[PDB]
Structure 1
Amino acid sequence: TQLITVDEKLDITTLTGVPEEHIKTRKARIFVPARNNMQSGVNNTKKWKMEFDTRERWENPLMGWASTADPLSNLVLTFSTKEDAIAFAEKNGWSYDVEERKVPKPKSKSYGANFSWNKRTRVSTK
């Protein structure tokens, strides 16, 4: 009711109990995941995935597994806008990198363009 409020940023790493080593050490990455190109389906777009950097993964000497001393290794954070993505990355204290979304460029194709008269565009095989 028009109360106390100050206008400042947020530093939630004092609250969430995380080690400051894993705060100042690592660095987030915010990106739209590129389409797995062997498939052709663009539903895997329309997100904003936040990952962390990959780190040390040695081998289990007894079996031949993959062991790591990395607690923040296998997270991913699905967001829906870059604005609140960068806002959250600022808000929870860690540093971050911002890649940029690259759309499929629209084109101009026709079967009639494939079957021209003098133009060298000619499929010659179908």
Structure 2
Amino acid sequence: TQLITVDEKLDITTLTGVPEEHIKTRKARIFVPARNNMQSGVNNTKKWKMEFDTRERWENPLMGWASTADPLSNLVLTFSTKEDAIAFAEKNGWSYDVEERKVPKPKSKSYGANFSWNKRTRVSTK
């Protein structure tokens, strides 16, 4: 046979070594990151990311540096699809929420529409 049938939910939380505080009190956010509106390039909007809720950052009394106590504060994960991210968060016991991908809707462009005979879409200058 050499194959067993495990009909249970996949759960590796006892094997990851993550302490309980950072399994059951964390909210994973699964999202495609928004395009930086300083720029027109879209190559950062191609993958799904997983991040966590930001915890407390405070001021170091000596230097004024940003002291943290959150180990997961920099943990950003990359996924090809939404279902891979959902499956990875369910496998690790993370409570998650998913934002759907926002695509830009197809616009209707026409250079001649800048010079219409009777429509408001004339450009006053060019």
| Both proteins in one fold, TM over 0.5 | yes
CA distance in 2, matches of 1:97, 1:41: 27
What do residues 67-123 of structure 1 show as CA deviations (whole Å, max 9, x unaligned)? 011111111001010011111111111110111111011111111111110111110
| Structure with more strand by fraction | 2
Runs of 4+ in 1 over 6 A off after TM superposition: none
1:2 positional shift: 6.1
Q: Which runs of 5+ in 2 are unaligned?
A: none
Q: 1:100 aligns to what SS in structure 2?
A: coil
Q: Which runs of 5+ in 1 are unaligned?
A: none
Instruction: Kindly report the root-mean-square deviation, in angstroms, between the aligned alpha carbons of the 2 structures.
Output: 1.1
CA distance in 2, matches of 1:16, 1:121: 59
What do residues 18-37 of structure 1 show as CA deviations (whole Å, max 9, x unaligned)? 11111111110000000000
TM-score after normalising by structure 1: 0.95
1:53 positional shift: 0.4
TM-score after normalising by structure 2: 0.95
Q: 2:73 aligns to what SS in structure 1?
A: coil
